[model samples]
Target: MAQILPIRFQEHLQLQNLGINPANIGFSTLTMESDKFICIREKVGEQAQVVIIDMNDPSNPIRRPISADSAIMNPASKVIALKAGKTLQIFNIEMKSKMKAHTMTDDVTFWKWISLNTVALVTDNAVYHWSMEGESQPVKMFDRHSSLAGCQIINYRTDAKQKWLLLTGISAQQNRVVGAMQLYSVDRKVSQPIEGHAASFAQFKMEGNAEESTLFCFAVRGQAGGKLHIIEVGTPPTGNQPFPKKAVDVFFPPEAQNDFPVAMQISEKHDVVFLITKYGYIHLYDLETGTCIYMNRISGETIFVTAPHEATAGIIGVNRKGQVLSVCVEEENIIPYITNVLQNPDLALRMAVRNNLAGAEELFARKFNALFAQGNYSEAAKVAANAPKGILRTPDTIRRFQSVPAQPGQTSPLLQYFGILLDQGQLNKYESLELCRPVLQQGRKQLLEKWLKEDKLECSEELGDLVKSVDPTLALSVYLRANVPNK
Candidate 1:
């Protein structure tokens, strides 16, 4: 039997002696990036301990009795940034080197690794950037936008180029939870307010563009309905086209009242966006087409912190139940899971064709066969042309079209298939010959010449020979286009 679940979860890693910390605060003791170490402050035998467990080599934890308000490990290396109120220091554990030290004037409300070599220090009134390389001190980057007043900042995200920054916050008003965001431009030194709950920034390449486009995707749950808006935020890279925006209606549980989105993480690997709600529901949407691939309540307990899991190409987060968990697409089973479990062959086919996934070959082939056998040539042609990996565009398929008996008042299946190919442009060696043979025999020289002008026909020695019997000029043009010396 095939597996129904399309995700793999690692949730059993237990944190020893988690103290009574305020769970409402955005970032607390439990913190880790997929490639980095898991840094946590726990109590052992009534003694405080800062435990750093290597993600690659687990089970052996390096413990220190240092007191810190917050600790964040670098995503790449063994450097840790510890902040106690205003005094911040970064240490390289392997080299035993104190990389940098800085004291902020205001209390450091939150801090984390913004990059491999930089740390983001957020205060009540401003955000500062501290570089770990140079002996330079933390520099004040920008002031907090006035709209963030009375709002608790929950997340700080930046674009791939670090040109655009987003600060997301949450607050309650009129007996409803409202989400606020401050979008900042580092180069322009300007900020704009956005009303969104869960949002993420992804560098996605559009269907025809070679360069990656910066996409801003956000979710909002209001009095009427939940919605997701994905738009291209800035000017595209040099000579690249901008991506289209996607606005889709999201859903909430029927029994829920105050459910709003809490977090969003985009997987560049899978090109999927993960939107999580305050009540522990997850909506996974395809990044390109904005299709909601899967939606379910993955966790009953509220999850506060989430990070892009490098290992799984998914997302990892911590819940109120003190569980550090991750959910990643099971690459081997996802297509079948969507087909067998969700019973949505259309979605399964879309996903399979879009991502070049497996496990839906039989379904696609069977559909095309059934349609063709039932004299549904037009639709069967569409299905064959769009088949994933060009699996259905073979000699056997073309032979099936030729073998089909002609209907009373309908075009032959072979011609239907050839027409569809002409519309889409390009065909195999045999298909071009098969189509041109009939048109040339009927003395339809104009159609052959026009299609040749459009380069819709595949030219070869075989095609040249088929055309020579009816029209020598057409055969000569075919030989020229085919670059054949003799025809």
Candidate 2:
């Protein structure tokens, strides 16, 4: 039961020979984990260098021999942050000046440029936030709970305002990889402990809501099975209905028994969820209905880091081979994927009508032919008028209506079709040809003038050629409408 058409997988970016350190091969934390810029602390001859490759210009890396254990670049700016054990420093690449520097009491385990000017530093026992705006130190935000004690922190997420914060991690416990999650409120200073491996926060406009609300989604695989939970985090707008929590099953192939979800990305443009597993399979699902649109392997190796690609409303990630690949829905082929791949015609038609998209012309043609064969000409005409991309509104359709015989002393199917077609919209070339031909023969040329004035005809060279035999003046207008070169 498919609700929405899914997008096809595409490898948009692939880079080889990054000379990535073996330690940072599959761990995004060791490498800088951002889509805009991938900053790696690589060796340059004899000194440690920071190699930053802008995804826009991935081939040309801006390498700087700045000695550091780890480094990261700001997503939207030229500022770069680096750390060596307890000492952390931020540099402005454009100005070639030091913006900020701080000494950490505890070693910086994991850190990232959480925002344009804000950096999030995570230690073993607590989390800190350091700002680069003015004279400020790394502020202790929250402490780590017992749930994440042995787990390795993989990702940290926050809402748009940084009000609701979440930390996700994974660790082996009881012969299985267990997931740990901790959600904290900055204002309330409270934490809720949960079990999940991969999680992400998104802002979605729910139905009847005044503004976009924050949504939290997580995927987990336990001893029993796997599950994906989607729920609203904050309160709703004034008089707006709250979104219902959705919990759906996540299927893992039997061969990949140890494979769990490693990343979860949501596309705002299509309101779809992309779930990537440890084995590189991508599962696309609808947000509202929890329907699995499509699922297949997108990458051969393990994907280490992921970030939102806003230009295409897709998700981009870096794999173990230093290949930066992106996957988004193929908007053009959704209808075909839905009809031919998914094999759901009912859903295909509903999606076609809802989105005004194509790929459902065959569905419409079948419906039109079925009705026409049952002597339902007017309904068939209606189907043609509303068919996907107007593919059925053609000469063959008109001819089919004209061939059907009429009852004794009753109006013909062709007349009935034209009666409905006139109400639907203007006529095409062949429609105009057949429509005005017999009228001209019956000496009812005045009605043709009315239709001509109404602009019902799609004037073309052949149409002008047809009208030229009856009335050259009318053909002059047709030739003018067609913009015929000779005329």
Candidate 3:
């Protein structure tokens, strides 16, 4: 009974009817690669466990008991972070050693791997950083007295030279709950408090590369009702205050606004935001235009959505009976005429390259002839010049070179042919001088001078005779500049 809605520009949703465990709840899932995923599972009256599932062999999973309240793993290095009692323990799988086991003041509420060598941990009122090499103690990253309540490591880019951490807490001033959103930079090691919002309910960061700008979306519970707000952050800093720009209120549909948003994820590739409601409903909205794209009701409660890839993500929910339901979301671009071409793998490759090697040669021949008939000799020469080296020296291309008009000073077809021949190591210095003789005789003194100086065109008796005919003074200057003795 799982189906995708018939909406325009929507992701193709495919339901993978695989349940992990009826009584277990999934906290997080990370895709190690294309076919492997690491899932964290927790249940009552049992220690939390980490399960590695291979998509190829879904029926069997490798489980390991983790004695900690919360855990986060680094898929690149296969390292694990465990929060046991009031201490944070980091274990490296490759080295088979406990990297860091340090005690802290409060229980670890949330922890994330900032880098392969460093980890960031958050407690109720402060944030701390620990190193894998045990070079330093748990360094307090934020102000010790600040009332930081919750934080999330938003859309991280591996290629990005800098990383960001979003911190949310309430600062009391004039007896009002002034909710604040603070941005921390791992590279800068500085926190900038963001203004303009009520108490933070939920937030999502748009995922992208380092060059692309990131958008931070926050859903706040206002006095009237729940409202959604999106702001541009990261990369280009906005002035001194660094206040969020283009702050607009996103209004949900009348029926959906009443249902509070429990979880949210932003997909930069599709330019949409996926919101899961408290009443087991998923809503997809376009972040750019602030329009609802699609909505659907799923069976189960305590739902969670994880975007493993830009094109593919998944949603999981647990029913009252503790049955876990997982659904996979796939994206497909619909086009009318090219539907068959896209569906057929062989056809798609042919269309991409206009068939194989022989077909490509035919296409090139037609393009070259059209340009030649229009008297566009320079462009036509460029086409042949850029052709594959083996094809450029063919008899066909050489024959077309005869029809190119000889223009003085400007790039001409003959020059392109000789240049290509020289680059291919097929033309000797004598052949180059002979080929350029016509252009040199046409009073193009600058062209010959440049060829002689930059291109290292060899000088001979024929070249001296041609230079003398063009200008006797230039011939005398060339002889003097060459420092040639009387022969």
Candidate 4:
């Protein structure tokens, strides 16, 4: 069943859910206006009706009427509606009871909020930008991009010394994956001159196989993969191409296969990449090391990363199947550390080629060497499925051999030894031990018996001993049970 999770925080920090008709909601034009922790949804329906919802309390929400008039056509259709020659009305919400509605006195037809107080309104004449705290007129206006074009905006405000910048992308004709994106700096004073150009951020082409691919996100920081272009926007604009340096076409590690990535989120302190997919999966990549941390599917959509609309920190808000889940970047303190430990070595090499020299050296010298000492064990496992018949009986042989239970004496000698070495501490460690761990653990005994029967020690004792020491108990157990048939 579908359900929305209530905001599970202290009573004082709780919000009252804003109510809007659930039937007409769609993905494209679901506009949310936020003031700190509070968010409001405006659903313009079919009959020129508008409903405002409070998402403070995600579960049982409060629905209020914003536009009492139902005279016009379609107000609750998920798309932010704009009829030519008519002023799309907007409401300025002060408190639960206090509200002010203003019809776009200008030629503006549709409006989308950039922040609680800031909004981008579209008109047949031009695109007008307005702020609640500023003068009554639009603070900025532009005559570019189609009026009916689909657009998205992201604001980055990292620190106090930094000024706010806006990223705008528009898909005018539809079906075009490559769209126009621009970065602009806003002047807090008068509306006369906006003080920026199309050169504020470099434009890049987004490639995907889907017939009508949507530009879900842009890699804000960290590495860019594929034909990906890195557009750096601040006081001065910069762009970099990552495709020539790396094989994989993603911003994260090569191992992380992500599709329909809806959002790009950096950690609170700008340390990690929180790449979220359309399936609600979150694949985290280390910003410093360029390695994948963890991959998981969260409970919801409407996820937000970063905080303090003022200082702009890292925070993640997930609305899983309507159940609101929030994850803070600082909260994942252990993930980055663990990822550094378990990073794939080849990925480390690719990362080195991509720019991280010291990290690649460290991975090659320490992590990769240590893991490979087990004798190309990781690579072997990946190819085990396609190995020749004489190499191992069958893939099932490996599967059955690796499926041993954790209880003592129930497993083969190789498994026992490997399990002991692994400490059988966690589920993943236990699983790994049951697999390749057993092969090393019992290699000496099995080879020794075969050699004795053939009157030879040609089967490397060095390799056998290395295997035994890796998991002695499993090695010894396999050695003792070599001739025994399965019961």
Superior by lDDT: candidate 3 or candidate 4:
3
Model 4 quality (TM-score): 0.42
Candidate 3: where are CA atoms >4 Å away?
Answer: 1-23, 26-57, 75-77, 93-97, 114-118, 131-137, 144-163, 168-181, 185-211, 234-244, 247-258, 305-307, 310-487
The residue ranges of model 1 lying beyond 4 angstroms of the native Cα positions read 1-3, 16-26, 43-47, 337-347, 363-487
The candidate that achieves the highest TM-score relative to the unseen native structure: 1
Q: How high is the CA lDDT of each candidate model?
A: 0.78, 0.77, 0.50, 0.35
lDDT of 3 by residue, 1-487 (tens): 1233322322222222344454444334332222133444544255556654534455565567766666666634657777777888888654768877888878766566655667766666666767776558777766522434443322222223335556654444465344456666666767666532321111223222223345556554445445566555554543333224433343445665445555555554444566665556665554543445456666445453333333344333333333334433233321111223223323222322221122133445555676888878766665555443244445566556755676678675766667755553434435545565677656688776666565455555555666888887766655554456685
lDDT of 1: 0.78
Instruction: Report the error of model 2 at residue 459, Å.
Output: 27
Task: Give the lDDT of residue 377 in candidate 3.
Answer: 73
Residue 454, candidate 3: Cα error in Å is 22
- In candidate 2, what are the lDDT values of residues 322-373, reduced to their tens digit? 6778888777777677777787666667556444567777668889898977
How displaced is residue 473 in candidate 3, in Å? 36
TM-score for candidate 2, please give it.
0.70
For lDDT, candidate 1 versus 2, the one ahead is 1
Candidate 1 lDDT, 123-165, residue by residue in tens: 8888887889888888877888888887877877788888888
For candidate 4, write residues 370-437 as lDDT tens digits. 53345343333322222222222243434533443344544352343333323322212223333433
